[PDB]
């Protein structure tokens with residue numbers, strides 16, 4: 001199909017690991033992705049040969065490290081088709097990026113009596129910062145409800161948007177259900193009210209091309225460690241016209257223009273105004289390598305392979321007795337499920353005993369669990385390095401668990 | 407002396423680098439330290455063989471990664487002699503740790519009409535968050551002034567501490583002058599007023615043992631990348647009795663106990679309440695390795711070597727014509743200087759042309775520069791892997807620059 005999963009897997013050293021004496025089947029990339037040698041080695045080589053502080057130090061290594069950091073900002077901006085590299089801020093991850101927007105933009109744009117709209121499928125990262133903001137300023141957090149099939153009940157939007165709505169904060173792809181929301185249309189509607197839209201893209205950017213100009217979203221966030229990259233780094237994109245007006249959030253070195261203890265302090269320009277103190281330079285270098293690696297494979301090639309793998313898994317899972325799936329038939333990336341009346345914790349423990357890593361619990365989406373009237377679900381991630389054989393192991397494992405515990 | 411600089415240098419791959427065709431002399435560890443292979447490789451090996459999401463996932467790799475992360479928290483806590491591992495919070499760095507205190511503790515404890523005390527030698531990281539807090543709540547930022555020798559004018563403390571003083575925020579070791587402040591005594595005085603004390607320890611923890619119980623500081627912060635460790639990780643220590651009362655700062659997954667869109671959200675216990683979303687697990691593993699590496703060398707051994715190297719450099723620098731040094735004779739770690747009437751930028755450029763990396767500019771301490779009536783200084787860092795020969799190269803370089811540009 002162009003894509004070769006065996007060639008890709010050869011780049012990921014963890015996929016040779018054994019677990020409990022058995023070949024690992026790592027079906028938990030939606031919690032965090034494994035990293036290819038190209039990414040691991042790019043960061044290690046930077047530490048071994050090129051390391052220095054950044055912030056445009058006088059000397060050669062610092063100047064070169066600074067250039068590498070800004071070149072990754074440019075590469076990230078092209079990856080999401082931002083108009084400018086200066087629309088991207090380096091953060092620790094999706095979570096921090098949402099908190100930055102909620103404090104810097106939210107404190108200046110959301111007032112007492114206003115409302116913000118989220119959905120019932122959001123991850124806690126795209127819930128709690130908004131609850132904190134609503135409590136700080138006296139605003140209301142409104143919620144788009146779910147349908148049984150895991151899609152949003154969009155017929156409720158006329159009831160939720162009004163002349164006090166300032167922001168829609170919405171997931172691109174559900175980390176549990178795999179639902180992809182109709183962002184472009186939702187954003188058109190939000191903008192007709194003058195509301196802005198933040199998109200939580202943490203489960204989208206690894207599965208297919210993402211184009212923030214076509215989406216017209218006002219903010220977009222994602223995390224490097226889910227995009228086959230190092231931990232401790234993520235991206236916040238903000239339209240230039242908004243970002244230029246935002247006040248700083250964290251204060252300290254590098255985000256100032258002048259500091260005076262008698263005349264006060266002035267700030268530098270965006271995006272550097274939002275990056276206080278020494279950045280995670282090693283993580284940035286590794287993120288650049290991850291973007292290069294993913295672009296070289298091709299996100300449309302990845303999307304084709306993953307979609308065929310997902311279709312195969314859904315077909316095979318029909319032969320598991322008493323299996324409940326949650327979410328729509330066209331899901332991306334993740335399959336959420338429960339087996340009979342067995343606790344997800346026990347199902348996931350048996351799968352781990354078989355060498356198969358899935359996630360269990362509430363997946364940082366307690367309101368979603370409550371919608372489905374369950375405390376927890378299992379979740380298998382089917383990423384670009386996973387195989388039909390691993391899917392077969394999952395199915396056989398569930399069949400064995402059902403027979404043993406029934 | 408026990409310590410062997412040649413043995414230590416053999417662990418640091420960057421110190422073989424050439425710059426401008428010449429052997430690198432890296433005298434800028436105070437901006438960021440080089441890392442030994444043990445640290446680089448510990449992080450790489452974790453990514454190659456053990457990588458998974460943390461937060462106590464069901465499956466083997468996640469459970470083991472979670473245990474490693476909490477074991478590093480325990481190792482860090484023993485390194486600074488905290489009473490408990492649960493008094494330490496993982497942050498990106500010193501800067502973020504100060505911002506966390508300034509928002510979470512500062513918003514709840516500093517009111518209109520109150521005052522906070524800093525010093526004129528602080529880094530911007532230990533200035534700007536407090537300026538932001540003072541502007542948010544209507545409090546006054548007071549300043550301990552400098553003496554000409556780079557020490558604090560402690561006779562002013564009776565004028566600065568009063569019944570409205572809530573916090574002293576103070577550097578352990580100046581990043582420019584190398585002054586070590588008399589923290590234990592200053593903390594006793596602050597506590598007599600009921601004020602708390604945050605210590606900025608970013609330039610202390612690599613030079614000698616640090617014991618927060620003996621200091622009795624209420625908060626202590628430092629950064630991994632200056633302690634021979636990866637970027638993107640640092641530590642905030644807070645006394646348990648204070649930390650347990652502090653509200654969360656960043657919101658999202660992992661820091662909640664329950665999330666409801668109708669009944670609101672409750673928080674988990676400290677320190678995990680302060681760690682929202684996926685942590686920088688790779689950076690944490692690397693920080694654990696850096697602490698192990700430093701402890702194995704011995705901080706009293708490091709302190710002896712560095713102090714002998716500093717004494718040698720100060721003695722040799724007497725033979726540089728028209729050299730101005732800033733700070734006290736007993737400085738740690740850094741030598742700040744200007745050469746004649748030459749701009750620091752030009753001096754540092756010639757040194758870089760000789761293969762010698764120093765920092766130039768305001769060193770994120772504009773109020774300190776202004777105290778000395780200069781726009782900028784040069785700064786040479788003399789760390790545990792630097793040598794007498796590198797000091798000799800610095801001296802010869804300055805002599806050559808003086809002769810060429812005079």
Ligand SMILES: *Cc1c(COP(=O)(O)O)cnc(C)c1O
Pocket residue numbers: 030092093094095096123125126171173174175200202203223226659682683684
């Ligand atoms: C992972 C995830 C987050 C949180 O990202 P972090 O890297 O943990 O900050 C937010 N939203 C979704 C949909 C996620 O899958």
Ligand SMILES: *Cc1c(COP(=O)(O)O)cnc(C)c1O
Pocket residue numbers: 253276277278436498499500501502529531532577579580581606608609629632
């Ligand atoms: C480095 C430094 C800081 C800032 O630390 P980051 O790692 O850049 O956040 C704060 N204070 C002092 C004294 C420093 O040397």
Ligand code: NA
Pocket residue numbers: 096250502656
């Ligand atoms: Na932060």
